[PDB]
Amino acid sequence: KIEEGKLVIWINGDKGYNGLAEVGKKFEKDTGIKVTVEHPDKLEEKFPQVAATGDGPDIIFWAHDRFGGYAQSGLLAEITPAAAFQDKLYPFTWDAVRYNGKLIAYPIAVEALSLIYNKDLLPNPPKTWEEIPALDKELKAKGKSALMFNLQEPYFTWPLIAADGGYAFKYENGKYDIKDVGVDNAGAKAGLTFLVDLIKNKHMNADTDYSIAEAAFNKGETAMTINGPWAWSNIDTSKVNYGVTVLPTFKGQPSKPFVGVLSAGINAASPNKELAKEFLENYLLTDEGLEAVNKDKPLGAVALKSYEEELAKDPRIAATMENAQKGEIMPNIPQMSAFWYAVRTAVINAASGRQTVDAALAAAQTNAAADALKITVSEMIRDLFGDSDKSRKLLESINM
Ligand SMILES: OC[C@H]1O[C@H](O[C@H]2[C@H](O)[C@@H](O)[C@@H](O)O[C@@H]2CO)[C@H](O)[C@@H](O)[C@@H]1O
Numbered sequence: 001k002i003e004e005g006k007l008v009i010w011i012n013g014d015k016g017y018n019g020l021a022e023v024g025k026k027f028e029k030d031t032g033i034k035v036t037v038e039h040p041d042k043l044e045e046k047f048p049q050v051a052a053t054g055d056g057p058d059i060i061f062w063a064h065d066r067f068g069g070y071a072q073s074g075l076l077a078e079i080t081p082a083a084a085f086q087d088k089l090y091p092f093t094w095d096a097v098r099y100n101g102k103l104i105a106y107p108i109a110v111e112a113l114s115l116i117y118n119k120d121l122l123p124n125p126p127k128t129w130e131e132i133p134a135l136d137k138e139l140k141a142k143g144k145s146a147l148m149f150n151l152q153e154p155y156f157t158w159p160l161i162a163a164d165g166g167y168a169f170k171y172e173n174g175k176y177d178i179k180d181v182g183v184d185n186a187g188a189k190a191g192l193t194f195l196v197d198l199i200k201n202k203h204m205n206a207d208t209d210y211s212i213a214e215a216a217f218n219k220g221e222t223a224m225t226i227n228g229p230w231a232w233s234n235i236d237t238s239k240v241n242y243g244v245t246v247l248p249t250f251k252g253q254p255s256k257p258f259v260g261v262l263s264a265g266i267n268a269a270s271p272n273k274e275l276a277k278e279f280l281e282n283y284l285l286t287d288e289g290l291e292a293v294n295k296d297k298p299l300g301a302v303a304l305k306s307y308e309e310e311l312a313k314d315p316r317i318a319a320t321m322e323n324a325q326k327g328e329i330m331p332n333i334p335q336m337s338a339f340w341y342a343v344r345t346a347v348i349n350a351a352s353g354r355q356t357v358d359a360a361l362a363a364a365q366t367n368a369a370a371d372a373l374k375i376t377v378s379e380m381i382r383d384l385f386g387d388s389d390k391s392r393k394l395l396e397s398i399n400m
Contacts, residue, residue, distance in 0.1 A: 001055045004271040007035040007279060011061035012043050014210075014230045015262070019296025023289045027279050035279065051075045051267055058270040059280070063111065063260030064096040068332035071104040072379060076265045077273055078102045085281055092329070093303040096261040099332055105263035106280045108290075109299035111228050112324035113159060113257040114316075115248060119241040122146075122223040129160065129194060129250045136203040139223060146203065148213040149226035151195075151351055154343040155258060156226055159247055159327060161191035161343075162256035168331055168339045169372075178335050178372045183343060184365035191250060193357045196350050206351045229300040229320060244316040247323055257327040262299060334379075338371030374398060 002008070009024070011017050017037050024035030038057070040046050044066050050056040052073065060070075070076050080103070086094060093107035117125040121144060126135060136146035150156045158166070165187020170180035182188060198204045205212075217225040218238035225231075226247070235242055247255035264284070266276045283289050287307045293299060294311075300320050302308050311317045330336070346364035349355040355363070378395055385391035 002058060002267065002270055002272075005033070007033060007059065007272060007275055008057045009035065009037045009059045009061070010043055010047065010057040011037065011039060013039040013041070014228075014297065015039075015061070016230070016293040016296030016299065019293040020284075022292045022296075023283055024279075026288075026292075027283045031275070031278070033275055048073060048075060051269060054269040056267060056269075058267055058272050058276050060265045060267065061108070061262060063330065064105065064107065064263045064332050065258075065260060065330040065336050067097060067105050067263055067265055068099050069334035069337055069375075070265065071099050071102070072334045075268055076104045077268045077270070078104060079106060079266060079277070081106075081281065088305055089285070089303045090305065090308070093261055096329055096332060097263050105265040106285065107303040108262040108264055108284070109303060110301040110320070110324060111230075111260040111262055112300065112320050112327060113156065113226055113228055113247065114244045114319045114323045115224060115246065116217065116227050116231070116235070116242060116244055117224045118217070118220060118222075119243055121220065125224065125243070125245055126248050127246075129163075129248045129255070132248070133198065133201060133203050135223075136198075144220075145216075145222045147198075147224040147226075148204065148208050148216045148222045149224075150208065150210040150213055151204070151206065151347070152209045154340060154347050157192070157195055157347050158343070159226075159255035159257040160195055160250055161188050161347075162258075162327070163187070163250035163253050164190045166191055166256075167328075168336065169333070171331075176331055176333055176335075178333070178376065179369065181339070181365055181369045181372070183339070183346070183368055184361040189357055189361060192347065192350055192361065194250065195347075196357055199351055206353075229316065230297040232298045232316060233296070244319040246319065247326070254326040255323075257323050259324045259327050259329045261303070261329075335372035335375050338375055339368045342368035342371065 017039050021037040024037055027035050044062050047056060047060050048070060089107060097103055097105040097107050126132060132146050139146055165185045167182035169176045169178050199206055213225050216222045218235055218240060220240060264280055266273050285304050290302050290304060290307050301317055342364040346360040350357045350360040381394050
């Protein structure tokens with residue numbers, strides 16, 4: 001089901017796959033081992049689906065936030081770098097791929113959203129979200145708009161929602177409290193309420209997705225977008241005079257992007273775990289490998305110490321780091337997917353006017369907390385009963 005003697009790799013359509021294939025070709029040339037790169041859709045859902053029955057890729061690339069849930073499902077192999085190699089990467093990056101004492105992936109890069117603006121339309125960019133509406137009024141009269149960014153994917157809206165108090169799970173004394181969810185606080189209400197208002201005041205469209213925001217920005221139709229470093233190269237092709245900067249503050253407080261570490265995990269069912277380790281350690285995570293991917297779509301602020309000191313001088317990276325320190329490193333816990341489904345439903349509903357901000361978040365709060373708990377209970381019931389019918393038929397029930 002996974003061919004012994006070859007490497008298949010999954011990484012998302014927005015990332016430097018053609019650049020990674022290049023690294024795959026170099027590997028193939030020293031070791032004779034063919035490396036194949038693919039980007040199926042809904043990768044982060046497609047992976048556990050197929051790997052759960054022993055198929056899928058030898059290697060899986062996603063942000064570190066999904067990996068806790070994969071490791072917990074027994075889907076990843078433990079990764080075991082020698083001290084000397086661990087040393088070449090930033091402590092905090094290893095930390096985000098650490099789950100229950102075990103490293104469960106290789107950290108590749110630090111990804112954070114920034115405000116991307118067109119210097120020709122908007123020479124000085126807004127420092128605040130509260131100035132965006134007025135700005136749009138003025139651009140509208142020129143057949144232009146202030147801002148478009150993907151509203152379909154809560155990853156994008158979230159730094160506004162967190163700005164005044166939203167959070168996934170509370171973090172104190174080294175552990176997460178999956179019973180303390182921060183999606184329906186007053187601050188998360190204010191944040192979404194502002195976003196929803198921009199829609200009501202027709203300063204944005206509820207349908208705006210990733211394609212639509214990217215085409216509009218890169219064609220000069222809109223003065224601002226919110227996007228991660230992978231988007232920079234398409235904008236370079238456009239020749240649009242752009243800057244990458246700090247996100248606008250809301251109610252006076254910085255916007256809080258969820259920070260992701262692009263990680264690479266080995267499929268626990270892979271019969272090429274040794275080849276997979278050599279490709280990631282001696283080929284990808286080098287000045288050579290990273291630069292090959294980064295040339296295709298920029299990775300952000302790479303894990304590897306030696307190559308980050310070059311990338312660090314770039315103002316678009318610094319903008320990334322400043323956005324990143326103002327935000328929070330995503331949790332990697334299994335209950336995270338529950339937080340994301342619930343918030344995806346909420347933003348979508350309040351934006352499309354299907355529910356108010358308040359009924360939207362009230363339901364997101366209930367649902368994230370219950371799905372979170374459900375994820376934990378389910379694990380334990382598997383520990384108590386493995387797969388006696390008592391096990392399957394208790395799970396069946398508990399989920400509804
Ligand atoms: O919005 C839900 C989604 O947010 C994050 O996914 C990001 C990803 O980390 C980035 O690498 C880039 O591809 O944008 C994605 C969303 O469009 C979370 O990592 C992901 O788990 C979550 O479902």
